[PDB]
Amino acid sequence: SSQAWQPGVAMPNLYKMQRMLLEKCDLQNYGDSATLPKGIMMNVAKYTQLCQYLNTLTLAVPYNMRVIHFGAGSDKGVAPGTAVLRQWLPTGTLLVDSDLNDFVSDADSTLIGDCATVHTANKWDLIISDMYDPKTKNVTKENDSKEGFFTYICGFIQQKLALGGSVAIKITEHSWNADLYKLMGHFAWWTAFVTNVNASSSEAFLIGCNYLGKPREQIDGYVMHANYIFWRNTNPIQLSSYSLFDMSKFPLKLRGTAVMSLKEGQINDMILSLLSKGRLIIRENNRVVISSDVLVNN
């Protein structure tokens, strides 16, 4: 298994082209555990492998890039994922994180509360989500599209993600949403990525690379999630932390990607070409302001 030296495994294109029915996820390696470097947390290992994978894609990387991270709080009250993102991202990158409960973070700004209580008029270049509700998993009922925080993620992408931007959203067998898969078709490229350290889990990151703001391809989310599970059920992934031992090429290379403010009437086919190659970001560059709502009562 040559995949063991990779940071993880991306869903092969042929699996994306099937029309499968949703089945239970039954992983062969379920229960196994990867051997992490001494004293390293699973959350640190997982995010390190996600970033090592993102390095191989055509992410747009402007000056003073804007990154937002959802579901960043751990049970212990810290933000391991945020620490890895800050290590990975160019120095000076604006990094904002968020979660439902309080936690200590290395982010430039931390937002506590749900989506309905936070607001910004600013656009972002990269969205990372580790949001996940453990009570979502229920094997005694049908596995339908989830319509909670995922509806907010979809709304955030379609309104606050800059053209040329990218996303990495955590999903699982039971934590998923049909509209989010459909929205993957609005990017120049997409995949479902499984980290090698957590390959015994149904977890994956839906990765949308270079947002076009329009459907490049029509994707049925119900079918694509079924395709994802079929892939996982028929392709055992060997648990591996091998990639964690070589961090020499870890930092995201600065590309100094151009940021331009254009209108929908100016987005021609040559602009789409630049967006698709991660050579352009379309958004304004105003001061970044985030609002936090407070319900007041006596």
Ligand X SMILES: Oc1nc(/C=C/c2ccc(Cl)cc2Cl)cc(C(F)(F)F)n1
41, 94, 118, 254: which one contacts another protein (CB under 8 A)? Answer: 41
Q: Which of 46, 123, 146, 160 is catalytic?
A: 46
The answer to whether 210 touches 278, Cβ cutoff 8 Å, is: yes
78, 254, 267, 288: which one contacts another protein (CB under 8 A)? Answer: 78
> Catalytic annotation on 253?
no
> Catalytic annotation on 46?
yes
CA-CA distances (angstroms) from residue 288 to 67, 95, 108, 153, 206? 11, 11, 11, 19, 26
CB within 8 A of 253, min separation 6: which ones?
55, 61
Distance CA 285, CA 11 (A): 35
> Catalytic annotation on 130?
yes
Question: What sign does the CA torsion over 80, 84, 87, 89 have?
Answer: negative
47, 53, 149, 193: which one contacts ligand X (CB under 6 A)? Answer: 149
One-letter amino acid of 126:
L
Quick one: which segment of 46-54, 135-143, 145-153, 277-285 binds ligand X (CB under 6 A)? 145-153
Which helix (H) or strand (E) is 44 found in, with range?
A: helix 42-54
28, 100, 101, 104: which one contacts another protein (CB under 8 A)? Answer: 104
247, 253, 261, 262: which one contacts another protein (CB under 8 A)? Answer: 247
Judged by beta carbon, residue 68 or residue 226, the one nearer ligand X is 68
Q: Which of 130, 160, 173, 182 is catalytic?
A: 130
CB within 8 A of 120, min separation 6: which ones?
160, 288, 289, 290, 291
Judged by beta carbon, residue 8 or residue 71, the one nearer ligand X is 71
CB within 8 A of 174, min separation 6: which ones?
136, 137, 138, 143, 146, 202
Judged by beta carbon, residue 21 or residue 121, the one nearer ligand X is 121
Number of residues that bind ligand X (CB under 6 A): 17
Judged by beta carbon, residue 7 or residue 213, the one nearer ligand X is 213
Active site residues: 46, 130, 170, 203
Binding residues for another protein (CB under 8 A): 37, 39-41, 44-45, 48, 74, 76-80, 82-84, 86-87, 91, 102, 104-108, 244, 247-248, 250-251
